[PDB]
Amino acid sequence: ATPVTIIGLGAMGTALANAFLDAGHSTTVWNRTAARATALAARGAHHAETVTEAIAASPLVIACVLDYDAFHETLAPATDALAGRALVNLTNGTPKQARETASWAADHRIDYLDGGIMAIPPGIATPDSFILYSGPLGTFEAHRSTLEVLGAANHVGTDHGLASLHDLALLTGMYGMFAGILQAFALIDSEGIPAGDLAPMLTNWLTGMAHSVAHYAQQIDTGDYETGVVSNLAMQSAGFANLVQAGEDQGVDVGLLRPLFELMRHQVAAGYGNGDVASVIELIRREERR
Amino acid sequence: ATPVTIIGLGAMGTALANAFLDAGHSTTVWNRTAARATALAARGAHHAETVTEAIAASPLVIACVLDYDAFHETLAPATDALAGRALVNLTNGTPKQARETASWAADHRIDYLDGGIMAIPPGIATPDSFILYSGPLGTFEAHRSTLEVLGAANHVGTDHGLASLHDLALLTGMYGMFAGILQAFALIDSEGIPAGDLAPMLTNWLTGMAHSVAHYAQQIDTGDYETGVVSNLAMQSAGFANLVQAGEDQGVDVGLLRPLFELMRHQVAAGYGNGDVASVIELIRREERR
Ligand SMILES: NC(=O)c1ccc[n+]([C@@H]2O[C@H](COP(=O)([O-])OP(=O)(O)OC[C@H]3O[C@@H](n4cnc5c(N)ncnc54)[C@H](OP(=O)(O)O)[C@@H]3O)[C@@H](O)[C@H]2O)c1
Ligand SMILES: NC(=O)c1ccc[n+]([C@@H]2O[C@H](COP(=O)([O-])OP(=O)(O)OC[C@H]3O[C@@H](n4cnc5c(N)ncnc54)[C@H](OP(=O)(O)O)[C@@H]3O)[C@@H](O)[C@H]2O)c1
Known part of the structure; x- marks a missing residue:
């Protein structure tokens, strides 16, 4: 040893x-x-x-x-x-x-x-x-x-920087999830419901919706945000407006999700509402990759 | 029928x-x-x-x-x-x-x-x-x-508003996850790596770390953000600073996750660095629930 x-x-x-x-x-x-x-x-x-x-x-x-x-x-x-x-x-x-x-x-x-x-x-x-x-x-x-x-x-x-790049990418995904989890519990908490009452359903929803990952990757890698879309961005942004409004109605601070909300609305207004939500990556990826 | x-x-x-x-x-x-x-x-x-x-x-x-x-x-x-x-x-x-x-x-x-x-x-x-x-x-x-x-x-x-409250809470969790996924792919994309190269790892990581839901819910419901902590907030904020800095150094817009970074900093500067990250909920939940 x-x-x-x-x-x-x-x-x-x-x-x-x-x-x-x-x-x-x-x-x-x-x-x-x-x-x-x-x-x-x-x-x-x-x-x-x-x-x-x-x-x-x-x-x-x-x-x-x-x-x-x-x-x-x-x-x-x-x-x-x-x-x-x-x-x-x-x-x-x-x-x-x-x-x-x-x-x-x-x-x-x-x-x-x-x-x-x-x-x-x-x-x-x-x-x-x-x-x-x-x-x-x-x-x-x-x-x-x-x-x-x-x-x-x-x-x-062999590039020494690559392990941290992958590490930090995985942590990046994780912290977005964590923000979502905190904000989800804040909304259910605002009506006096214990977080534990939502946790099973939230775990299952996030587990299932975590298969968007490969679908999202394929959209990004092909640049095709329109083929086979079943949850269009215009619909998703309308729902996002309601979870923001509901949080405000219930006295919850929804600042954590405002950046994504604003990006999605911007993209609907720019004409991408019939495509999927992953098209928003074009607004954040490095300029030379757009 | x-x-x-x-x-x-x-x-x-x-x-x-x-x-x-x-x-x-x-x-x-x-x-x-x-x-x-x-x-x-x-x-x-x-x-x-x-x-x-x-x-x-x-x-x-x-x-x-x-x-x-x-x-x-x-x-x-x-x-x-x-x-x-x-x-x-x-x-x-x-x-x-x-x-x-x-x-x-x-x-x-x-x-x-x-x-x-x-x-x-x-x-x-x-x-x-x-x-x-x-x-x-x-x-x-x-x-x-x-x-x-x-x-x-x-x-x-029986209250007709309750289905929508649960629905919107689950969507809230999902959009935080989606923000993390897009930012994660933007980071790996900044070195020219296809999103699909990261997809299996990211899917498994998000699936696994989604079992933090029950742990988070128990922390929130007990109000105890310190017992059993193995990933303290001061350490988590240090890593968050690196994923922000790594994105910015590669020309990626990291605005989707910067608000959570700020709340974690705030709780660290307020003396909660030895506890868990779920204590951030105190900064967003309805005032009557704090
Ligand atoms: N993944 C999903 O698609 C998904 C998942 C869960 C829940 N939902 C919910 O399902 C609902 C519908 O979503 P979707 O995906 O089916 O959206 P969609 O494919 O964009 O369809 C929108 C529907 O709304 C109708 N509509 C819009 N404005 C209208 C008006 N002013 N008067 C009458 N009808 C109107 C449209 O009619 P026209 O065809 O005449 O435009 C169409 O039937 C949404 O509330 C959404 O949140 C969707
Ligand atoms: N905990 C996790 O879940 C986890 C998961 C994955 C990766 N990591 C990584 O593991 C690393 C350590 O995390 P941890 O959870 O072990 O954090 P921790 O429990 O807070 O321990 C911090 C360690 O850093 C040392 N340290 C801090 N400043 C120092 C300095 N200026 N000179 C010498 N030593 C110093 C501490 O020494 P003292 O005891 O003398 O303060 C201690 O050994 C981090 O980079 C973290 O990102 C942690």
């Missing part, structure tokens, strides 16, 4: 360390706040006093801290200790930060993968969990068996 | 009519534009030339036009002809419009249910379809077997 070092013992990093300990790896851990390592150390983890001690302990170093600023602040002084090792950054960040970190790593003989954890901490090391990786295939395949302790391992390309 | 009249033969009204034809009901149809009624007559429907002729053919009349303005313009002149019949309004509208319509119906001896179709036209009469109804239980139970031709029939309350 490959020895592994975890840098960062928040909710996610603690889950990673526990998963490697469960799988029998010699697991070295470090956290800015040392007290977050105490339970892990009692469990058999090697609690390093410094970042450099932690890094020197293992051929594979996994970083999972709050953000890029934390990642940079923590590892920049330890550049020399990372020489010759594999660094897997599971800290959330942008494609730009991943490509800049990759340039730094190539300048200092650090093998580098950028990754995005598509799981919550209790999901780590369960069939729910998968993690996206980008960077050199040699580094990915060398550590794939170790990484698969955490969940499925999906290498999405 | 109860004779049925369908008023309004757009994409969804036509699906309703076809379902009753396939189930062997004598199906009378009317549409403002005659061509949609002629098309259904070729499939066995009875094409009524006028609204009153359509209404007088059946003890059960189902309306499915664009909005309540269309419903009122169409049916107000035929008010006396509806006396003694059951009118089921599946036109999208608000709770206030449902209640106003119910008052009109009661004043004129019209049995009235207000409903919301949670299906798309090709889903009618399949296991995917369900329709929410509100109004008197006696009327609902009298026509339930006929209504179940179209999908599951869920009576959600």
